[PDB]
Amino acid sequence: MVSRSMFDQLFPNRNSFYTYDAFIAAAKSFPSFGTTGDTDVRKREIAAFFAHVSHETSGLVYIEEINQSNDYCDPSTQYPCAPGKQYYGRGPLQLSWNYNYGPCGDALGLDLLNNPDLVAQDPVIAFKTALWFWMTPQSPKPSCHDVMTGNWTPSSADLAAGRVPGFGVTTNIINGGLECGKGNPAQAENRVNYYKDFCNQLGVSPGSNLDCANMRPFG
Q1: Which CATH number covers residue 21?
Q2: Cross-strand bridge partners of residue 95
Q3: N or C: which end of the chain has fewer CB within 10 A?
Q4: Is 56 a catalytic residue?
């Protein structure tokens, strides 16, 4: 794991909300994060997670999505929207939509469906929501964790679609419908730029298959 001082090197401008101790506590909740594979692989995973976080929150400066005009409610019997609440982006990976706050809360033992603001109020919970997304396979997508740590077996369909192991597939999992394939490559390039910078700081290679312009979104 990166030291306290390295966390400050990687996130020099972050809001004080996002403490190293809160990150470490959240990570203890997901003990395979950053501890799977050889030490270079562990650093690539950490760098990849932090690169997406840095993209989504401008270096852990932001906690909440700026535009709060939209409730991000897709009516659901399984994950019903709470009256008066909104599911706009919160936390390091900008958890969004009732149908993600629901399962995320269930995984963390929290009622995030009815108290979605909690993700922007408790930093351990904030980091746990991001690690939940990173660590959890959600069919048909593997977890970003498994992709980066050599534990994902792409299907034959994945290979034919260009979904090969590396950072690019993580962008695809996170937002490939808009950022990969024929999409405008600007946002994916920003993610890769953070990733390459963080890998350089940690002394490892970014590895192969970084871009996602040559892959289709998952089904």
Answers
A1: 1.10.530.10
A2: 90
A3: C
A4: yes
**Closest C-alpha to 144, from 171, 110, 123:** 171
Residue 37 lies in a domain: yes
Domain for residue 208, yes or no? no
Resolution to 1 decimal, in Å? 1.1
Name the structure determination technique: X-ray
Amino acid sitting at position 116: P
Whole-angstrom distance, CA of residue 122 vs CA of residue 119: 6
Q: Please tell me the distance from the alpha carbon of residue 7 to that of residue 4, in angstroms, as a whole number.
A: 5
DSSP 122: -
Strand locations in 53-172 (E): none
Does the residue 76 lie in any domain? yes
Active-site residue (options: 56, 65, 179, 189): 56
The string of DSSP codes covering 14-48 is: --TTS-HHHHHHHHHTSTTTT-SSSHHHHHHHHHH
Residues 56 and 73 reside in one and the same domain? no
Asked whether residue 166 falls in the same domain as residue 148, the answer is: yes
Backbone angles phi, psi at 23, to 5 degrees: -60, -45
Q: Residue 56 sits in which domain range?
A: 4-62+137-202
Are 53 and 82 found together in one domain?
Answer: no
